[PDB]
Amino acid sequence: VGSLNCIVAVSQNMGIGKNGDLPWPPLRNEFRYFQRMTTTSSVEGKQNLVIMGKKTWFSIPEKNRPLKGRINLVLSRELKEPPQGAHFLSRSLDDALKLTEQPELANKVDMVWIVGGSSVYKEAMNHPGHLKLFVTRIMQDFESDTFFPEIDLEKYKLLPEYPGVLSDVQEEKGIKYKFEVYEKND
Ligand SMILES: NC(=O)C1=CN([C@@H]2O[C@H](COP(=O)(O)OP(=O)(O)OC[C@H]3O[C@@H](n4cnc5c(N)ncnc54)[C@H](OP(=O)(O)O)[C@@H]3O)[C@@H](O)[C@H]2O)C=CC1
Ligand SMILES: CN(c1cc(F)c(F)c(F)c1)c1cnc2nc(N)nc(N)c2c1
Numbered sequence: 001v002g003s004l005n006c007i008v009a010v011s012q013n014m015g016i017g018k019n020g021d022l023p024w025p026p027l028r029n030e031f032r033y034f035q036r037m038t039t040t041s042s043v044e045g046k047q048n049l050v051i052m053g054k055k056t057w058f059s060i061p062e063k064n065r066p067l068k069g070r071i072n073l074v075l076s077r078e079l080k081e082p083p084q085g086a087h088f089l090s091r092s093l094d095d096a097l098k099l100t101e102q103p104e105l106a107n108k109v110d111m112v113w114i115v116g117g118s119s120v121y122k123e124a125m126n127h128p129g130h131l132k133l134f135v136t137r138i139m140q141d142f143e144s145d146t147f148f149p150e151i152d153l154e155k156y157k158l159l160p161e162y163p164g165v166l167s168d169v170q171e172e173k174g175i176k177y178k179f180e181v182y183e184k185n186d
Contacts, residue, residue: 001100004129006114006121007037008148009136009177015144016116020059023142027172030136033179034115037134039069040164041110047071049088049109051096053117057083071109073099075120093123122149125156133182134165140175156182 009030010016015023041048049071057065057074066072066085073088073096082089088105090096093114100109114124124131126149133156135148161167162181170177 001106001109002041002043002111003132004097004112004114004124005132005134006124007034007134008116008121009034009138010148011138011140011142011144013141013144014147015142016118016148017059017146018142018144020055023144024138024140024175025173027138027175027177029170029172030177033136035067037164038067038113038115043110046108046110048111048113049073049100049105050113050115051075051090051093051120052115053120054079054083056116056120057086070113071105093120093127118146118149125149125151128186130185131183135180135182136177137180138175138177139169151182155184155186157184158182 008016011023017023038048038050047070050067051073054074054076066087071088072086073090074082074086075090075093075096077091079089088099090099099105100112114120133151159181165179165181
């Protein structure tokens with residue numbers, strides 16, 4: 001199994017969601033970037049596996065779920081089976097990562113992409129190991145009710161550029177944003 005990554009888009013006041021939607025109006029190319037980064041796998045005959053909390057899973061429009069071309073795994077302690085359209089269910093992040101080592105998935109999974117919510121990000125970010133964060137900075141404040149956890153820059157290094165990621169300022173619907181990639185290894 002390849003690398004472990006989180007991917008998020010975040011406003012200046014650290015918001016990632018409001019009432020199970022994004023805080024900002026749809027940014028079509030930002031979403032295109034999210035799709036491209038999570039779907040693209042180097043390794044022939046494998047797919048990447050996206051892990052998300054139950055609320056994130058239900059925040060994706062039914063038309064778009066499961067996220068096509070990736071293996072979709074939902075985290076939940078309440079659910080007893082994967083939701084309709086999902087592939088896998090686990091009771092914790094650690095369980096999910098362990099599953100990835102089982103026979104069912106060991107040779108199927110390339111990169112693992114955590115896509116929220118707020119508590120799945122936090123546990124990933126604070127667990128020892130090699131982890132990258134792909135962070136889109138939406139450069140304006142937006143009213144939010146969910147937030148991205150604190151990035152500890154003592155351990156997460158912002159990379160000066162990364163292949164496949166644009167380095168300059170993007171703008172859609174009058175909202176400026178930029179892409180960043182952070183890396184820790186501890
Ligand atoms: N813009 C961005 O970058 C992104 C924003 N978002 C936003 O996130 C918002 C959702 O907020 P948030 O509270 O984070 O929702 P989450 O996606 O974190 O949902 C968490 C729920 O799923 C289950 N769960 C979560 N973590 C675990 C875990 N670690 N182990 C086992 N089960 C777990 C729990 O349900 P249970 O009670 O059944 O156990 C929990 O109530 C959405 O509205 C969406 O808009 C989401 C992704 C990206
Ligand atoms: C979870 N998700 C999402 C949430 C919604 F509410 C939607 F209506 C939607 F179409 C996608 C989403 C959207 N854009 C993202 N962009 C980046 N960079 N990273 C994510 N994890 C992400 C998630």
